[PDB]
Design a protein around this ligand. Structure first.
Ligand SMILES: *CCC(=O)Nc1cccc(C(=O)Nc2ccc(Nc3cc(-c4c(-c5ccc(F)cc5)nc(SC)n4C)ccn3)cc2)c1
Length: 351
């Protein structure tokens, strides 16, 4: 339409409503390309993400669809809120591309992770992640795949989570895919198919926190086997009560491995990794390790809750009940490509 215009961006074309001006690439990911733009209607800077033919892959289709639907089920400053959703195509038959628009953020969390460790920044970033997760949980959404690639940050250290994680059933049966999926941030109970509760998400917060300290991914498994091995190498073989919760076939798989004692948290995260040379810095290194030791707990029956993390002395200087308790607003079958296409098209057309 006359309502759209096209901009060349590397290999791609962004065909966007004319309100969006001065497009500039940010970059690309598994789920689309992103540009910054000025929105002349709102008089503010936005990020625009293009989803190309998401209906052509069942995993991509389900993600796009569930994320359009769940967008309306949350309302919190630490979770994505779309300003606009559109397609330049005019009929179901011609439909190919979805464009999502939100507030422009300044950086990916990975860029912050690369910066020198600072307790005020790390604690504030973790506090916001935990506020977001708590909000998701109150809306009935237990994420199970929180990772730095879906977290963005502004220059004022404010943070947003951009995705809603896994289908409800994921983590209720053993995880190995026909191809590589990375699972560096997924909880033990999920990857082993044990079922899960809310504190499944605390594991992933612990992975992120640890990564902030080390500047390195904690458990970078090459495949599902190596993933588990990176975990037990560092944290130790889990307790028999945890093994007893495994389906017998899974239990044999898990136990047919070396037995590890695990390393203490001071060895996992040495003093040298933290700011030194003041009582404040010594105490904060101790509190950070304490919190790490409570989140990076293989057995979810022994792992800290979201509320306990929020109330931990490392985090709680930021605690504001208006942020922590902000309330959310008042179907996962499989489908063919054509079914997914229509479902997604209908969601786009209706908001
Ligand atoms: C750690 C490695 C790295 O990222 N390096 C690096 C080096 C130099 C520059 C950059 C950089 O350009 N990063 C940057 C700039 C601006 C943003 N803003 C942004 C991105 C996103 C976004 C979206 C999205 C989702 C929904 C929507 F409606 C619009 C946009 N989807 C993704 S991929 C999960 N991103 C990142 C939203 C809002 N603002 C980010 C990063 C990086």
């Amino acid at each position: 339409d006359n309502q759209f215009y096209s901009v060349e961006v590397g290999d791609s074309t962004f065909t966007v409503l004319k309100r969006y001006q001065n497009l500039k690439p940010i970059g690309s990911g598994a789920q689309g390309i992103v540009c910054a733009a000025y929105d002349a209607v709102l008089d503010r800077n936005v990020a625009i993400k293009k989803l190309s033919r998401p209906f052509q892959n069942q995993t991509h289709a389900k993600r796009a669809y569930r994320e359009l639907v769940l967008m309306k089920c949350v309302n919190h400053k630490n979770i994505i809120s779309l300003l606009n959703v559109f397609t330049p195509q005019k009929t179901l038959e011609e439909f190919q591309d979805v464009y999502l628009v939100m507030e422009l953020m300044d950086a990916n969390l990975c860029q912050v992770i690369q910066m020198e460790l600072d307790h005020e920044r790390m604690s504030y970033l973790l506090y916001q992640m935990l506020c977001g997760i708590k909000h998701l949980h109150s809306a009935g959404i237990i994420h199970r795949d929180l990772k730095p690639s879906n977290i963005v940050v502004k220059s004022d250290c404010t943070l947003k989570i951009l995705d809603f994680g896994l289908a409800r059933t994921a983590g209720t049966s053993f995880m190995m895919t026909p191809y590589v999926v990375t699972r560096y941030y997924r909880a033990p109970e999920v990857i082993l198919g044990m079922g899960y509760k809310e504190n499944v998400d605390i594991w992933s917060v612990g992975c992120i926190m640890g990564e902030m300290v080390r500047h390195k991914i904690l458990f970078p498994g090459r495949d599902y086997i190596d993933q588990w091995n990176k975990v037990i190498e560092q944290l130790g073989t889990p307790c028999p009560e945890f093994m007893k919760k495994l389906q017998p076939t899974v239990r044999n798989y898990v136990e047919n491995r070396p037995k590890y004692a695990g390393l203490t948290f001071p060895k996992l995260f040495p003093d040298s990794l933290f700011p030194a040379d003041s009582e404040h810095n010594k105490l904060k290194a101790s509190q950070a390790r304490d919190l790490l030791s409570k989140m990076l707990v293989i057995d979810p029956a022994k792992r800290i809750s979201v509320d306990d993390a929020l109330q931990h002395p490392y985090i709680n200087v930021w605690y504001d009940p208006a942020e922590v308790e902000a309330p959310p607003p008042q179907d996962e079958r499989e489908h063919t490509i054509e079914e997914w296409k229509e479902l997604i098209y209908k969601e786009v057309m209706n908001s």
